[PDB]
Amino acid sequence: SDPVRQYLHEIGQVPLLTLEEEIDLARKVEEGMEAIKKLSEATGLDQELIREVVRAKILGTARVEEVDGKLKSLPKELKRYLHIAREGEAARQHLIEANLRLVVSIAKKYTGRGLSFLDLIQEGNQGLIRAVEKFEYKRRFKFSTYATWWIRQAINRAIADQARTIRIPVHMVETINKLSRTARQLQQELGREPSYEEIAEAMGPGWDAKRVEETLKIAQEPVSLETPIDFIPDENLPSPVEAAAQSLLSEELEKALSKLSEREAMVLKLRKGLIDGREHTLEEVGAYFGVTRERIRQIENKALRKLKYHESRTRKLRDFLE
């Protein structure tokens, strides 16, 4: 029922190609970008503008026109190039339409790994778009199953690019398939699920145990199934009681700092950075506060004691746990 049947109907409704109609149409592409290359270097359109901006026009079943302008003012050496490129504009006309059906019957394999049959076509089908193109019309093997690669190889590059995984360069899939096929390899030839280090030998250089474990620790298709059974609780982000035990310690210090002298209280504030958040050095504290470090350094320690001494005789040694 999947919407694929809808596409499966539009796809398998139009016939493919005869046999000689495959090449005849293709050659139009060559001289297409070529005859278009005429105007390309002619005014400096990099041969990609005249084509891309026109292929849009070629797709006159939808947008623009534009460029033609100068392409009609055609000098005495032009008018033939007008039709040539417009006869070549037919190169992007029929081709590409057949294969759509020829491919699909291939995606029926990767019906698993990742992406449903329907998404795999997007990748698989799009590979044809690139592969159709770089076809060596020269060779005498004629287009067909030779495109299957571009497709499938674009499919492997697809399933790799897309999976319920985070990021998978061929650095892990090709390696996990290894330890996997290897673990499954030693398996049938042992009888028990081999350990991790035991696989080390199966592999080789650098393949100890830690690394063999780092791989099957990242992913393959785990990363949980997501939500069975708000399947999981926990917490501690902006702790409630904590954010409450905060204002205390602060306001508590404000009180514990009441029995202090400005030539020490503020000295501490700025110093340890309590005022706002500026942990000013002892120099900044010495500048503003005239007198050079000497008596200041003493005032520094003059504190601590006068700040700890007032503790053992009056608790507050519990604020440390938070």
């Binding site: 809808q6 339409e97 759509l100 990748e123 089908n125 949980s224 997501e226 069975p228």
Partner: protein, 113 residues
């Protein structure tokens, strides 16, 4: 009639939940995201799969993906989008049976506080 759509709008916070141990299992992940993805990927593959001139047939068959891909974050009410694909299983928490639905979030945080 701005009901036609051109910019779905999913948040991100709710998901970035990470490792849960004890008793007998750990590893950790979320849903709505892997559900979300469906979208962007498509809406991304569309553009780059057209600019390179993908004539007719193809074009629609794709594009529409977005459409279907949109009936994602929204409401899974048709054929389903099970996880574990192929996966003959569970239902993607798509605001259906959960979030907005009944007894999942709405029927839950209204009184089930």
């Amino acid at each position: 009639p701005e009901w036609m759509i051109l910019e779905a709008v999913p948040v991100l916070p709710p998901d970035l939940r990470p490792m849960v141990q004890v008793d007998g299992g750990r590893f950790a992940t979320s849903d709505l995201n892997d559900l979300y993805r469906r979208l962007i990927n498509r809406n991304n593959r569309l553009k780059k799969l057209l600019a390179q001139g993908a004539p007719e047939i193809i074009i629609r068959n794709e594009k529409r993906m977005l459409q279907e891909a949109v009936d994602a974050v929204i409401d899974n009410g048709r054929r389903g989008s099970p996880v574990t694909n192929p996966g003959s299983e569970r239902p993607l928490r798509s605001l259906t049976d959960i979030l907005s639905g009944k007894q999942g979030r709405f029927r839950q945080n209204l009184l089930g506080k």
